Design a protein around this ligand. Structure first.
Ligand SMILES: OC[C@H]1O[C@@](CO)(OC[C@@]2(O[C@H]3O[C@H](CO)[C@@H](O)[C@H](O)[C@H]3O)O[C@H](CO)[C@@H](O)[C@@H]2O)[C@@H](O)[C@@H]1O
Ligand code: CA
Length: 519
């Protein structure tokens, strides 16, 4: 005959719940709730925020929905017909997560000898073939056909050592300082990820408008996690049943006004605020009204899969400061996470920080199906046929204090099914010279692995403008570019790339055979 003890008594009464209708089991569970107010791991994507993001996605609100693309205009990247790192032969690769070489303070796409430079993950569809390649075009050239491939940064290789996403900026001497994810799969095929850096020197043959990779120097591991702020591989190994995600990837370089250099990356929380059964009882993870939190608590407890996911979810967007050894960096300081999602999601990807005026904007991509709340993300699949989103936050300070945009953190939401040609992911905001209140959203279009059909390859999406509002909101704009345009200027807009959600329109968001096809 247990009795409610402490703050939870007040919670139950506030919620209009009849205390005598509670079982002993329910009372015992309620008595385990910890009402501590102390935030342990930065700004949180709470259970309520997640529910709101999913709900907003289902609403397909023009403010946040990814614009429809003209499906008939989407092509595989010509520069993706290229030597493959794992075969040494010319093959038709697909291309996904990509990033421009950009100025570290402003994020502006860098002009290197009249060229723009982009590094991206490419490989053969349905092969474990994860390596990074250098692509280049004349600076400001909007023609997707003009991009060329300088080849894989690290030359030929195998799945034992992979390269996943990062960022890149120029050194004073004209070399590229590349930040990337080195992945070692030698321990029972696990994706053992580490933040790495290398210096890339280029050869330019002016008359052939041809760039090649000349030297790759100083390749080394920068950060693997500290164990307190961020989970280490050894920590992950200790407890993994198969249900725990590994993350130490997607490093985004940014410099502050004083020239200090930071990497903002995807990880998981360490012992500062670790995953586990205890997370279900931390009231601060819920983030709704007390009454809604109470409903959520019982929902998690009553659903075995949700409960399991809640125990393992601890995605974080971390930050470290580097020392001043630009070409051979070491870690100078490890900070608490900027954002974390204990209890809520075990995957938040591709973080991107842009300084606009005197404020820092942090965006990240996520697939809501990696969230703990199955009921919420399953509903997004039912409504739209996909569950992708971009989330966003703003701070007056680079290393802490982030506030969610559009209340919940929602910024972009999926608008077409995941297996359509015009599905997108890996949103990456790029600042726009001469427009300090807008960002150009780049992404890849078509999901990997021929899910949209044989020959339909992941390729660079048409880019679109996002309006940033000083009142901590954002608005998708009806302004779109050619595929693979990283630089918004006065020749960038191409309204022909815009689509409509109509079966038989020439600019349909669906290719023939997709409208009404199973997801
Ligand atoms: O390719 C690595 C690169 O992709 C990112 C997201 O852009 O991680 C994505 C991720 O999932 C992709 O691949 C899985 C197949 O297992 C698929 O289910 C999903 O639809 C894809 O987005 O890639 C790794 C390995 O597959 C997963 O850990 C991760 O979920 C980015 O963070 C990373 O640099
Ligand atoms: Ca986890």
């Amino acid at each position: 005959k247990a009795e409610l003890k402490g703050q939870v008594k007040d919670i139950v009464e506030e919620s209009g719940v009849d205390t005598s209708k509670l079982t002993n089991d329910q009372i015992n569970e309620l008595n385990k709730i910890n009402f501590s107010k102390e935030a342990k791991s930065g700004t949180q994507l709470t259970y309520n925020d997640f529910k709101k993001i999913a709900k907003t996605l289902i609403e397909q609100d023009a403010r946040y929905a990814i614009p429809f693309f003209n499906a008939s205009k989407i092509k595989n990247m010509p520069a993706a017909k290229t030597l493959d790192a794992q075969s040494g032969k010319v093959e038709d690769l697909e291309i996904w997560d990509s990033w421009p070489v950009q100025d570290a303070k402003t994020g502006y796409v860098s002009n290197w000898n009249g060229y723009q430079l982009v590094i991206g993950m490419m490989g053969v569809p349905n092969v474990n073939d994860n390596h990074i390649y250098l692509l280049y075009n004349k600076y400001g050239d909007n023609d997707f056909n003009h991009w060329k491939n300088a080849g894989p940064i690290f030359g030929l290789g195998t799945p034992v050592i992979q390269q996943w996403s990062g960022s890149a900026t120029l050194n004073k001497d004209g070399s590229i300082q590349l930040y990337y994810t080195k992945v070692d799969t030698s321990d029972n095929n696990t994706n053992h990820q580490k933040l790495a850096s290398a210096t890339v020197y280029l050869n330019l043959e002016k008359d052939q408008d041809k760039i090649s990779i000349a030297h790759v120097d100083n390749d080394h591991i920068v950060f693997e996690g500290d164990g307190y702020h961020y989970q280490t591989y050894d920590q992950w190994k200790e407890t993994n049943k198969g249900a725990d995600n590994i993350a130490m990837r997607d490093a985004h370089v940014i410099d502050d006004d004083n020239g200090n250099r930071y990497l903002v990356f995807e990880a998981s929380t360490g012992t500062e605020n670790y995953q586990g059964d205890d997370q279900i009882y931390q009231w601060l993870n819920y983030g709704g009204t007390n009454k809604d939190n109470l409903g959520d608590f019982f929902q998690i407890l009553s659903n075995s899969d949700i409960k399991d996911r809640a125990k393992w979810s601890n995605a974080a967007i971390g930050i470290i400061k580097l020392n001043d050894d630009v070409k051979n960096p070491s870690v100078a300081k490890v900070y608490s996470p900027l954002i974390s999602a204990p209890m809520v999601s075990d995957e938040i990807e591709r973080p991107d920080v842009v300084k606009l005026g005197n404020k820092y904007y942090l965006f990240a991509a996520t697939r809501l199906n990696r969230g703990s709340n199955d009921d919420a993300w399953m509903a997004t699949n039912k409504a739209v046929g996909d569950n992708v989103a971009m989330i966003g936050y703003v701070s007056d300070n680079l290393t802490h204090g982030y506030v969610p945009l559009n209340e919940s953190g929602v910024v972009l939401t999926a608008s077409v099914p995941a297996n359509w040609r015009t599905a997108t992911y890996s949103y990456y905001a790029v600042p726009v010279e001469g427009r300090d209140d807008q960002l150009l959203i780049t992404s890849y279009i078509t999901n990997r692995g021929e899910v949209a059909g044989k020959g339909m390859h992941a390729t660079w999406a048409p880019s679109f403008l996002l309006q940033i509002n000083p009142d901590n909101t954002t608005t998708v704009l009806a302004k779109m570019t050619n595929q693979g345009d990283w630089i918004w200027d006065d020749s960038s807009e191409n309204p022909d790339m815009m689509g409509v959600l109509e079966k038989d329109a020439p600019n349909s968001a669906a290719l023939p055979g997709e409208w009404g096809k199973p997801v």
